[PDB]
Design an enzyme around this catalytic site. Structure first.
Site, PDB file in Angstrom:
ATOM      1  N   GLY A  17     -49.376  24.945  30.589  1.00  0.00           N
ATOM      2  CA  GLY A  17     -50.900  25.223  30.098  1.00  0.00           C
ATOM      3  C   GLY A  17     -50.878  25.800  28.542  1.00  0.00           C
ATOM      4  O   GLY A  17     -50.568  26.595  27.848  1.00  0.00           O
ATOM      5  N   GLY A  19     -54.120  25.793  27.567  1.00  0.00           N
ATOM      6  CA  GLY A  19     -55.372  26.121  27.676  1.00  0.00           C
ATOM      7  C   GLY A  19     -56.070  26.476  26.538  1.00  0.00           C
ATOM      8  O   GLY A  19     -55.625  27.597  25.911  1.00  0.00           O
ATOM      9  N   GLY A  20     -57.370  26.118  26.316  1.00  0.00           N
ATOM     10  CA  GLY A  20     -58.121  26.753  25.253  1.00  0.00           C
ATOM     11  C   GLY A  20     -58.784  28.049  25.681  1.00  0.00           C
ATOM     12  O   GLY A  20     -59.004  29.086  24.784  1.00  0.00           O
ATOM     13  N   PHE A  21     -59.201  28.180  26.941  1.00  0.00           N
ATOM     14  CA  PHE A  21     -59.830  29.120  27.477  1.00  0.00           C
ATOM     15  C   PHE A  21     -59.213  29.572  28.776  1.00  0.00           C
ATOM     16  O   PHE A  21     -59.801  30.482  29.510  1.00  0.00           O
ATOM     17  CB  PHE A  21     -61.347  28.760  27.879  1.00  0.00           C
ATOM     18  CG  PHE A  21     -61.397  27.579  28.779  1.00  0.00           C
ATOM     19  CD1 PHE A  21     -62.233  26.427  28.121  1.00  0.00           C
ATOM     20  CD2 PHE A  21     -60.891  27.152  29.815  1.00  0.00           C
ATOM     21  CE1 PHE A  21     -62.352  25.274  28.443  1.00  0.00           C
ATOM     22  CE2 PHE A  21     -61.194  26.031  30.509  1.00  0.00           C
ATOM     23  CZ  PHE A  21     -61.789  24.849  29.795  1.00  0.00           C
ATOM     24  N   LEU A  23     -55.303  29.072  31.333  1.00  0.00           N
ATOM     25  CA  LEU A  23     -54.021  28.322  31.744  1.00  0.00           C
ATOM     26  C   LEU A  23     -54.064  27.118  32.383  1.00  0.00           C
ATOM     27  O   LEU A  23     -55.000  27.112  33.017  1.00  0.00           O
ATOM     28  CB  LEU A  23     -53.097  29.399  32.441  1.00  0.00           C
ATOM     29  CG  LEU A  23     -52.082  30.348  31.703  1.00  0.00           C
ATOM     30  CD1 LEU A  23     -52.509  30.852  30.433  1.00  0.00           C
ATOM     31  CD2 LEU A  23     -51.393  31.212  32.391  1.00  0.00           C
ATOM     32  N   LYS A  39     -57.148  24.052  35.744  1.00  0.00           N
ATOM     33  CA  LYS A  39     -57.600  24.756  34.627  1.00  0.00           C
ATOM     34  C   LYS A  39     -58.338  26.202  34.839  1.00  0.00           C
ATOM     35  O   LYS A  39     -59.562  26.075  35.335  1.00  0.00           O
ATOM     36  CB  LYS A  39     -58.521  23.895  33.726  1.00  0.00           C
ATOM     37  CG  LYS A  39     -57.599  22.570  33.164  1.00  0.00           C
ATOM     38  CD  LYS A  39     -58.630  21.612  32.112  1.00  0.00           C
ATOM     39  CE  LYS A  39     -58.932  22.323  30.957  1.00  0.00           C
ATOM     40  NZ  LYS A  39     -59.691  21.571  30.206  1.00  0.00           N
ATOM     41  N   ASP A 138     -65.568  15.751  20.783  1.00  0.00           N
ATOM     42  CA  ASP A 138     -64.194  15.935  20.592  1.00  0.00           C
ATOM     43  C   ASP A 138     -63.191  14.941  21.102  1.00  0.00           C
ATOM     44  O   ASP A 138     -62.144  15.085  21.399  1.00  0.00           O
ATOM     45  CB  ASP A 138     -63.656  17.392  21.295  1.00  0.00           C
ATOM     46  CG  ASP A 138     -62.409  17.948  20.626  1.00  0.00           C
ATOM     47  OD1 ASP A 138     -62.285  17.822  19.277  1.00  0.00           O
ATOM     48  OD2 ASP A 138     -61.637  18.527  21.357  1.00  0.00           O
TER      49      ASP A 138
END
Ligand SMILES: Nc1ncnc2c1ncn2[C@@H]1O[C@H](COP(=O)(O)OP(=O)(O)CP(=O)(O)O)[C@@H](O)[C@H]1O
Length: 276
Positions: A17, A19-21, A23, A39, A138
């Site tokens: 992870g 991850g942006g927000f 894991l 996610k 994006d």
């Protein structure tokens, strides 16, 4: 409509992870034995300001956009989990396009490049044929997940990470950061509006990176303000190599046109790429 999976319907395997927000974990659906990416939304109360904790809206925006999309060249959402809020996405086994292209000693062969190009084009075509069209906002090589690199595989590449994606029947605005991938009308000011044609511009940069294996705009070096000016006002674009097929060069050049309306419909793009 998005199904709900309980903690017993899936079994965890390991973590991978960035991850942006939260894991990201690797796992399996108990029913299908289907390999799956999880996610999670993790709100670091000892991490961020009340304005940073607005990564909830990103997790949300992803779920909303993902729930309506069902295409072979777009990462599939299997369902949702609670405590914590979790997205259950199909696991894409060959990493992402960004990291694979870093491997210079092993260049992707021409026929596989075309498969990747067409795979992503079909995914984006699907997105833009939605009512209203899906604007990913994006599109870049890290957000292209590789299913296979075999030229005869059903699916080679999938479009992923719809976190900053917008779907509106009206105009969309907002200043975007990652300037080497983003349309000129998205990088100058938040005060100007743009459409799905911004994704068509980003796609051209993806076509370039596959073709050359190099980062878009890597051949230039400017300060941020000067760089944004060149892209916007002076039509600064990465150099397409002299050996590039004439039809591919044309697709790329039209797709990164300064004027958004000159960027072709994806019916044209798919057709042109398929003649390569
Ligand atoms: N469906 C999937 N299949 C396989 N791997 C996945 C996956 N979804 C996420 N990953 C992996 O988990 C990690 C989480 O990255 P994420 O998907 O959050 O993008 P990101 O926002 O970190 C990109 P950037 O760091 O440029 O902002 C990545 O290394 C990605 O390869």
């Amino acid at each position: 409509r998005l199904p709900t999976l309980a903690d017993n319907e899936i079994e965890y395997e390991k973590q991978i992870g960035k991850g942006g927000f939260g894991l990201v974990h690797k796992g399996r659906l108990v029913k299908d034995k289907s390999v799956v990416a999880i996610k999670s939304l993790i709100l670091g109360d000892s991490e961020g300001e009340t304005e940073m904790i607005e990564k909830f809206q990103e997790f949300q925006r992803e779920v909303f956009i993902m729930s309506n999309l069902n295409h072979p060249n777009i990462v599939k959402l299997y369902g949702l989990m609670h405590n914590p809020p979790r997205m259950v996405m199909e696991f894409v086994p060959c990493g992402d396009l960004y990291h694979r292209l870093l491997d210079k000693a092993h260049p992707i062969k021409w026929s596989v490049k075309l498969r990747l190009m067409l795979d992503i084009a079909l995914g984006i075509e699907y997105m833009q044929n939605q009512n209203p069209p899906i604007v990913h906002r994006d599109l870049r090589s890290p957000n292209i997940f590789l299913q296979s690199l075999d030229e005869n595989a059903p699916v080679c590449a999938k479009v992923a990470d719809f976190g900053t994606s917008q779907q509106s029947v009206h105009s969309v605005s907002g200043l975007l950061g990652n300037f080497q991938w983003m349309a000129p009308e998205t990088i100058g000011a938040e005060e100007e509006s743009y459409t799905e044609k911004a994704d068509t511009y980003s796609f051209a940069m993806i076509l370039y990176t596959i073709l050359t294996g190099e980062g878009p705009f890597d051949e230039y070096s400017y300060g941020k303000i000067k760089f944004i000016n060149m892209i916007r006002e002076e039509g600064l674009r990465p150099t397409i190599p002299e050996d590039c097929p004439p039809r591919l060069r044309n697709v790329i050049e039209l797709c990164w046109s300064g004027d958004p309306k000159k960027r072709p419909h994806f019916s044209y793009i798919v057709k042109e790429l398929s003649e390569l």
